[PDB]
Every structure is written in structure tokens, then in C-alpha cells.
Amino acid sequence: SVPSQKTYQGSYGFRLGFLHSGTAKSVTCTYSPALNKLFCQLAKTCPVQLWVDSTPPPGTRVRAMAIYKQSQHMTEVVRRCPHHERCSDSDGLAPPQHLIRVEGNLRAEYLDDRNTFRHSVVVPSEPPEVGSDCTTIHYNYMCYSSCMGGMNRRPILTIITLEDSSGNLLGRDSFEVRVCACPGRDRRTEEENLRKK
Ligand SMILES: CNCc1ccc2c(c1)c1ccc(Br)cc1n2CC(F)(F)F
Numbered sequence: 639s640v641p642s643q644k645t646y647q648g649s650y651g652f653r654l655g656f657l658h659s660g661t662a663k664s665v666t667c668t669y670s671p672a673l674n675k676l677f678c679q680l681a682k683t684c685p686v687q688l689w690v691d692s693t694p695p696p697g698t699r700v701r702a703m704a705i706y707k708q709s710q711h712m713t714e715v716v717r718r719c720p721h722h723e724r725c726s727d728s729d730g731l732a733p734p735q736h737l738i739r740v741e742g743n744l745r746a747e748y749l750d751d752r753n754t755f756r757h758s759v760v761v762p763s764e765p766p767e768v769g770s771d772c773t774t775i776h777y778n779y780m781c782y783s784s785c786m787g788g789m790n791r792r793p794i795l796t797i798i799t800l801e802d803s804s805g806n807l808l809g810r811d812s813f814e815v816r817v818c819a820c821p822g823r824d825r826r827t828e829e830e831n832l833r834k835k
């Protein structure tokens with residue numbers, strides 16, 4: 639009923655990385671290591687780095703899925719709100735109900751799980767470009783955390799899984815997400831609250 643969120647590096651040493659984008663009022667995506675939390679504007683590019691210590695086999699894939707963070711909501715499928723699922727903003731590949739999209743990857747596949755009804759987006763895993771030490775996937779979040787009838791102010795986590803060609807688990811990592819109008823201010827506010835507590 640609930641996908642695992644346990645961090646698991648696995649045989650290949652899989653883990654995520656994030657850029658250091660700062661907290662200026664104009665920032666569109668920013669990651670807080672102290673909160674393990676990404677703050678981003680609606681439908682803006684969120685770069686997520688994929689790091690491994692050793693090379694996984696051909697056919698390895700990378701899946702992203704959102705779940706509610708609070709235990710009393712974990713069994714509810716995270717989906718776009720009644721407004722955004724109808725707003726005709728599809729990219730030609732993502733179903734309009736899906737919160738998480740991958741940008742700029744024609745091999746992205748979108749799954750509606752036939753048993754759990756949860757949504758996810760999966761891409762073939764690829765090595766870095768020549769000159770780079772990690773692979774970057776660009777995600778978009780297609781509703782605000784506040785959207786009524788959707789996330790409705792409830793915090794979510796994104797779970798990133800490294801999978802073999804059958805979908806078996808090779809590695810797992812995760813981070814909280816807030817989709818909001820002013821990620822820089824909200825990151826500063828939440829980090830201050832953490833320090834005060
Ligand atoms: C030192 N490691 C460089 C590196 C980084 C990331 C790498 C790879 C190598 C690599 C090699 C083959 C395949 Br298939 C995917 C690969 N990825 C992406 C991910 F998601 F698996 F991490």
C-alpha cells in the first residue's frame with residue numbers, strides 16, 4: 639500500500655546530488671541539505687544529479703514517484719489537482735494527472751500502476767556526458783503544494799529508484815519537495831525554523 643523510502647545505495651553506490659542554487663528571492667529551484675528538501679516553482683526545471691561508484695548494467699532505469707510524507711496520508715495517491723489535471727498543458731507524453739514529469743527525454747515512460755494506481759515516470763539510465771562525473775535528470779512538478787483538491791498543503795517526498803530491466807530494486811534515495819511561489823524565501827524560513835528548534 640506504501641512504497642519504501644529507505645535510503646539504499648546498493649551494489650553500485652547509488653545516491654542523488656543537488657546543485658547549490660542559493661536562496662535569492664528570484665531562485666526557481668533550490669535544495670536544502672539540512673532539511674533534505676527541494677523547494678521549487680511550479681513547472682520549473684529541477685536538476686537532480688545521479689551518482690554511482692560503479693557502472694550499472696545496460697537496461698538499468700531510474701524511476702521517480704511522489705508519496706505523501708505524513709503517515710495519515712501515505713496511502714493516498716499523489717496526483718494533480720482538479721484544476722491542473724484539466725489545464726491542457728501536456729507535453730505530448732506525460733498524462734495530465736501526473737505530478738512529476740521528466741523534461742527533455744523522449745524515452746521517458748509514464749506508469750499508472752495497475753494495482754496501486756500510483757503514478758511514476760521512468761527513464762533509461764545513461765552515463766554522464768564526457769567531462770562530467772554524474773548524470774542529471776531534469777524534473778518538473780506540475781502542481782503547487784497548496785493546490786486545493788490535490789496536495790492541499792500536505793508535504794510530499796519524491797522517491798528515486800535505480801532499477802534493473804525487470805523493475806527490481808538496485809538503489810533508492812529520496813527528498814522532500816515543496817512546490818511554491820518563492821522557494822528562496824521558503825527555504826530560508828524553514829531553515830531558520832529548524833535552527834530555532
Ligand atoms: C563514477 N561514476 C560515473 C557515473 C555516474 C552516473 C552513471 C554512470 C556513471 C552510469 C553508467 C552506466 C549507466 Br546504464 C548509468 C550510469 N549512471 C547514471 C546512474 F543513474 F546510474 F547513476
Ligand SMILES: [Zn+2]
Pocket residue numbers: 718719720721722723780781782785786788
Ligand atoms: Zn494544481
